mmCIF file with all atom_site columns, C-alpha atoms in Angstrom:
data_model
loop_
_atom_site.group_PDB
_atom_site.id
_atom_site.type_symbol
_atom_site.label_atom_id
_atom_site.label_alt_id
_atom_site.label_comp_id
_atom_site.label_asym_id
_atom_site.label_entity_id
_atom_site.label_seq_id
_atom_site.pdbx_PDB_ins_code
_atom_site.Cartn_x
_atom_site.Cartn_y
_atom_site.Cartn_z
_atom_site.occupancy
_atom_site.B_iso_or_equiv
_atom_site.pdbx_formal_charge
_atom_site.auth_seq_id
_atom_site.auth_comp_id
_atom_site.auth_asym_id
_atom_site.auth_atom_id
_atom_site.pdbx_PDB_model_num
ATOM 1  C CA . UNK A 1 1  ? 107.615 -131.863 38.576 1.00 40.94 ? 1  UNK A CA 1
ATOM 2  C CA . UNK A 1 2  ? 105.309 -129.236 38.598 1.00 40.62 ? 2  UNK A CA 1
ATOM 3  C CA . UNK A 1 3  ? 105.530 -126.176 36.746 1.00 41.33 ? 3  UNK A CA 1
ATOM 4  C CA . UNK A 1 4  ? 103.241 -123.104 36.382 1.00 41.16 ? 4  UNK A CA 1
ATOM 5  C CA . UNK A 1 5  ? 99.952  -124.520 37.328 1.00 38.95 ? 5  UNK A CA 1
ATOM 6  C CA . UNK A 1 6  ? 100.978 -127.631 35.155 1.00 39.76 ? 6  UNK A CA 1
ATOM 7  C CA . UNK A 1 7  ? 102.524 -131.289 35.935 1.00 36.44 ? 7  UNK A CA 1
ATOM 8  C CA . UNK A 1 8  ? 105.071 -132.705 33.018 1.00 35.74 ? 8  UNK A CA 1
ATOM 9  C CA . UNK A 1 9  ? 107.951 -135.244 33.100 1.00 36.48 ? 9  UNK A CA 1
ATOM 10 C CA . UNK A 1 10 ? 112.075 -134.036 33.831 1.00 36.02 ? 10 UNK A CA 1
ATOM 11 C CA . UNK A 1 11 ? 114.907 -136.201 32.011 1.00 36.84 ? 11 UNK A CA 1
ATOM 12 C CA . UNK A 1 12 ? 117.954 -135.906 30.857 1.00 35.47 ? 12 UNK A CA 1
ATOM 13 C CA . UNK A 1 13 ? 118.584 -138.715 28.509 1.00 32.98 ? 13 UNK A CA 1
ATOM 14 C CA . UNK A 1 14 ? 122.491 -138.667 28.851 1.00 32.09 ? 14 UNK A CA 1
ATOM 15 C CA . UNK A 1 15 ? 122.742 -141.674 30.934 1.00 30.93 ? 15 UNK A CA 1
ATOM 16 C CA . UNK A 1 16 ? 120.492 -144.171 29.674 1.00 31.09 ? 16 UNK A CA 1
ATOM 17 C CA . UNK A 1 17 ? 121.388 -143.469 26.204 1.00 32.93 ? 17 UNK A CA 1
ATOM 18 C CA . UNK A 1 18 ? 123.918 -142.184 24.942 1.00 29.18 ? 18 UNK A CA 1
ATOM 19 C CA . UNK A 1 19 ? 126.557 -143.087 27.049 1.00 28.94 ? 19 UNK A CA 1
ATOM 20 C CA . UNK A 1 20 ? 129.832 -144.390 26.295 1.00 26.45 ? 20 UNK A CA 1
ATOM 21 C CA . UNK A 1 21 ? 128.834 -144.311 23.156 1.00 26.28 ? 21 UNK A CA 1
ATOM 22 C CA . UNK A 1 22 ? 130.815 -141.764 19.897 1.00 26.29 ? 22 UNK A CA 1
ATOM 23 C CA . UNK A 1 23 ? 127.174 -139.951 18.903 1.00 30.03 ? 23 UNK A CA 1
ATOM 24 C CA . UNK A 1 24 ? 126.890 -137.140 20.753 1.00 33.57 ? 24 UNK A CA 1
ATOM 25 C CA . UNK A 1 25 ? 124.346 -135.229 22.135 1.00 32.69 ? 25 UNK A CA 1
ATOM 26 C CA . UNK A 1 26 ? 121.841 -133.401 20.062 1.00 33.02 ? 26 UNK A CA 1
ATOM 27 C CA . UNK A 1 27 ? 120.046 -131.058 22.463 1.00 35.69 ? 27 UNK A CA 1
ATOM 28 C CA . UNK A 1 28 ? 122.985 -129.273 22.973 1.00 36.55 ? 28 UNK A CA 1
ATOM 29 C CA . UNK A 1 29 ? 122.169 -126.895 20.192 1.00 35.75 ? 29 UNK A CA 1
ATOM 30 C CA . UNK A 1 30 ? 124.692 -124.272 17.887 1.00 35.11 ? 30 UNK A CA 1
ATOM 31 C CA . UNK A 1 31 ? 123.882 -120.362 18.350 1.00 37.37 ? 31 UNK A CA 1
ATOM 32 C CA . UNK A 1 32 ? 124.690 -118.207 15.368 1.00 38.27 ? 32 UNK A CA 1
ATOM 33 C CA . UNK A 1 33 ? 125.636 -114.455 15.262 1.00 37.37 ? 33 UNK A CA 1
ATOM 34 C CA . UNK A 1 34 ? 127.234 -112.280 13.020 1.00 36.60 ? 34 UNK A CA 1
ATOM 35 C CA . UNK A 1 35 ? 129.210 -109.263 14.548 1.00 38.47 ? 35 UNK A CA 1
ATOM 36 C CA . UNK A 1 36 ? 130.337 -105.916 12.278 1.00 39.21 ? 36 UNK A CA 1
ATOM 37 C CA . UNK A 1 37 ? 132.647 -103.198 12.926 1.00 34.00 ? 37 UNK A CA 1
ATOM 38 C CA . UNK A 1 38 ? 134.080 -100.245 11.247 1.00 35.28 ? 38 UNK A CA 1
ATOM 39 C CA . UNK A 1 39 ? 137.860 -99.770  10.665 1.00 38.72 ? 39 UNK A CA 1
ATOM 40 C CA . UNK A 1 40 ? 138.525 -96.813  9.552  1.00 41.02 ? 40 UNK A CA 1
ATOM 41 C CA . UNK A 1 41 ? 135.898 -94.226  10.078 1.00 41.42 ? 41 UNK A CA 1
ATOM 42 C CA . UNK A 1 42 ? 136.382 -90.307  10.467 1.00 44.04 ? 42 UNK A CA 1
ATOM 43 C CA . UNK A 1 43 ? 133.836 -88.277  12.435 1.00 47.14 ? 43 UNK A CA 1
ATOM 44 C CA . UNK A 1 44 ? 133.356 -84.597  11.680 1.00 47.33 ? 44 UNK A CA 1
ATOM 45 C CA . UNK A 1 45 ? 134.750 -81.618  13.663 1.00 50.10 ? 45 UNK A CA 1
ATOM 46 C CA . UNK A 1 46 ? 132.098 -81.251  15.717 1.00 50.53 ? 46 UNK A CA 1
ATOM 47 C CA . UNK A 1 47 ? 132.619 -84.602  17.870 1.00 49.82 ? 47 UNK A CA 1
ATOM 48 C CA . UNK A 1 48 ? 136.235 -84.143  18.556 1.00 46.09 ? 48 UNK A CA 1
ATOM 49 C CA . UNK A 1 49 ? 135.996 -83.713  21.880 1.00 45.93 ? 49 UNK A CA 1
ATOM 50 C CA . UNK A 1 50 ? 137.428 -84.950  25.091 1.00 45.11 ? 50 UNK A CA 1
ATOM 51 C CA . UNK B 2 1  ? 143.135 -167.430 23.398 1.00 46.16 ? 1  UNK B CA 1
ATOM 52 C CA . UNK B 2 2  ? 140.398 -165.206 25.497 1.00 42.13 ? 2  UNK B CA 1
ATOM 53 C CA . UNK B 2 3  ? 139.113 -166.059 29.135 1.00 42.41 ? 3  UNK B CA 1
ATOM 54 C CA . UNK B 2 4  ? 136.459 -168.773 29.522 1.00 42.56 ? 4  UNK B CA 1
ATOM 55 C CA . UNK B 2 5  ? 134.529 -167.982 32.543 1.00 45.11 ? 5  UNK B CA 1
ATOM 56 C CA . UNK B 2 6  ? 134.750 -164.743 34.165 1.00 47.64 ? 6  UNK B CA 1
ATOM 57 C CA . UNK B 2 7  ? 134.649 -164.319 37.707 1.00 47.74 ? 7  UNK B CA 1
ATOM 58 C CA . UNK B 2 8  ? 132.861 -161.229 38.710 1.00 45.26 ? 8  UNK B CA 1
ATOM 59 C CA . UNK B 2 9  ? 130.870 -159.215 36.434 1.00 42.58 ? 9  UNK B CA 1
ATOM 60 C CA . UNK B 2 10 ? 132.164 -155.087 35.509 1.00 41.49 ? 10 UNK B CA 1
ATOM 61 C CA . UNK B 2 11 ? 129.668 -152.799 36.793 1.00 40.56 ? 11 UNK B CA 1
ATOM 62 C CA . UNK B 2 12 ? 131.207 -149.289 35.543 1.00 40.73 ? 12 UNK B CA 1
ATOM 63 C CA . UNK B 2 13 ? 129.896 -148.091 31.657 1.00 43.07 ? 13 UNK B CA 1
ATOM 64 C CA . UNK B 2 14 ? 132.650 -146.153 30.166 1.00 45.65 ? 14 UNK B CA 1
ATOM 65 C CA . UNK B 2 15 ? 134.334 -145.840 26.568 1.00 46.28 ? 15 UNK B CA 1
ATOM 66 C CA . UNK B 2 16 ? 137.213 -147.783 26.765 1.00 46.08 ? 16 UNK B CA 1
ATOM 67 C CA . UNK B 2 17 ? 139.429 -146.799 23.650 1.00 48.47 ? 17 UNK B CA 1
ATOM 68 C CA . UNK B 2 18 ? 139.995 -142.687 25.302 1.00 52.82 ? 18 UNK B CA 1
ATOM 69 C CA . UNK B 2 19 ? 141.279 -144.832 28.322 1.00 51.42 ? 19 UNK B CA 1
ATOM 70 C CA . UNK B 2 20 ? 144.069 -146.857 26.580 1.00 53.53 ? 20 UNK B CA 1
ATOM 71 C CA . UNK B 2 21 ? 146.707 -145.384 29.354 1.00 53.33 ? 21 UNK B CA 1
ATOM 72 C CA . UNK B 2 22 ? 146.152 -147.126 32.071 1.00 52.43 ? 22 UNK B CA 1
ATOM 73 C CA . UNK B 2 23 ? 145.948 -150.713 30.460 1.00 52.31 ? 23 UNK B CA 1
ATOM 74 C CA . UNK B 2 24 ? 149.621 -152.825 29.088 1.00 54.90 ? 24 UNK B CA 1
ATOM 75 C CA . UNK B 2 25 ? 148.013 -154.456 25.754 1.00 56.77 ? 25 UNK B CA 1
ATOM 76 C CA . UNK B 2 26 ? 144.692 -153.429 24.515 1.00 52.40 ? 26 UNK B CA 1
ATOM 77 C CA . UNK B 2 27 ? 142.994 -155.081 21.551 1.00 55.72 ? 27 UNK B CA 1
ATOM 78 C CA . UNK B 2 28 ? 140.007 -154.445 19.970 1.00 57.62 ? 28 UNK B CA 1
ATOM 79 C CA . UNK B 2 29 ? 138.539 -156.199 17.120 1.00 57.28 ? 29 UNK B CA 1
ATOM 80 C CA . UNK B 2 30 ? 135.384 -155.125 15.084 1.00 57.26 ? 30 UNK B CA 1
ATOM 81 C CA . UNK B 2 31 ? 133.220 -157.883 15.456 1.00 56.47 ? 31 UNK B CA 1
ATOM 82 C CA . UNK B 2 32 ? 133.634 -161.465 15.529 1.00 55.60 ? 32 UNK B CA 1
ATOM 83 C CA . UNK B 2 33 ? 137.446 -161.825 14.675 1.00 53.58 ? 33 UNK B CA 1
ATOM 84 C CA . UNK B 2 34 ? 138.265 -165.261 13.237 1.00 49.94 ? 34 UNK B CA 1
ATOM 85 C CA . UNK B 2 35 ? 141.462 -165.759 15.086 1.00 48.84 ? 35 UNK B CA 1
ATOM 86 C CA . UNK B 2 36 ? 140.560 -165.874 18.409 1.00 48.25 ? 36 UNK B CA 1
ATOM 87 C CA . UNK B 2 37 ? 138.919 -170.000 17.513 1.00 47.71 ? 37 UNK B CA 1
ATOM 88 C CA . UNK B 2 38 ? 141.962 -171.763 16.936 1.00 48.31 ? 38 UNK B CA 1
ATOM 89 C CA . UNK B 2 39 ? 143.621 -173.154 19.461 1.00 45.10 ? 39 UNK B CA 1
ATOM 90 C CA . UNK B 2 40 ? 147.031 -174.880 19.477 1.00 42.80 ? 40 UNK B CA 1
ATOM 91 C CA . UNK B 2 41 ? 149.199 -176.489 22.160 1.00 44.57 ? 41 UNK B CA 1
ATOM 92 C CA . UNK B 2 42 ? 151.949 -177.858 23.104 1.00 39.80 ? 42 UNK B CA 1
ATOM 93 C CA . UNK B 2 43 ? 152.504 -181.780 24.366 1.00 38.57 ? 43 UNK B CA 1
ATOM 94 C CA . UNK B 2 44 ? 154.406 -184.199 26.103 1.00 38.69 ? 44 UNK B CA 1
ATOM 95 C CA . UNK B 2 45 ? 153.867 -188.057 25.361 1.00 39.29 ? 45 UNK B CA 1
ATOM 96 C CA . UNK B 2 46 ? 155.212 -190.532 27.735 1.00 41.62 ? 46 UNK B CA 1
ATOM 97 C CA . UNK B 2 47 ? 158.352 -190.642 29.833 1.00 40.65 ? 47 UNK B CA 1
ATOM 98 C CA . UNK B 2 48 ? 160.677 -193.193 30.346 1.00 42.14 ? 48 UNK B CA 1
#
């Protein structure tokens, strides 16, 4: 394939290897975030508004 | 007491063992079991 102004390979190695086989795949990756939230905050008089 | 000579080869690659459902017995030994070398029959010696 050619990409950008570049030429380079394309495969997905999940049928050559890998298959039928109990190791899985490693490119699929794990992502990681944290999330935060406040339970039982007050806000002062001057934001109670509708 | 296995096959001796298959008849046409298997062309699809698939793990067998998540597939048990659709098969009546299903066996599968590690790696060289050493019961499937003896054999043993039964005979019949002369008839009068």
């Amino acid at each position: 394939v050619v990409v950008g102004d570049r030429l380079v390979f394309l495969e997905a190695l999940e049928k050559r290897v890998y298959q039928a086989t109990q190791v899985p795949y490693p490119l699929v990756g794990n992502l990681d975030v944290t999330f935060v939230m406040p339970l039982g905050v007050f806000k002062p008089a001057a934001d109670r508004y509708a | 007491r296995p096959a001796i000579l298959p008849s046409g080869q298997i062309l699809s690659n698939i793990e067998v063992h998540s597939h048990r459902a659709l098969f009546d017995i299903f066996k599968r030994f590690r790696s060289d079991d050493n019961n499937l070398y003896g054999a043993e029959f039964d005979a019949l010696l002369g008839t009068y």
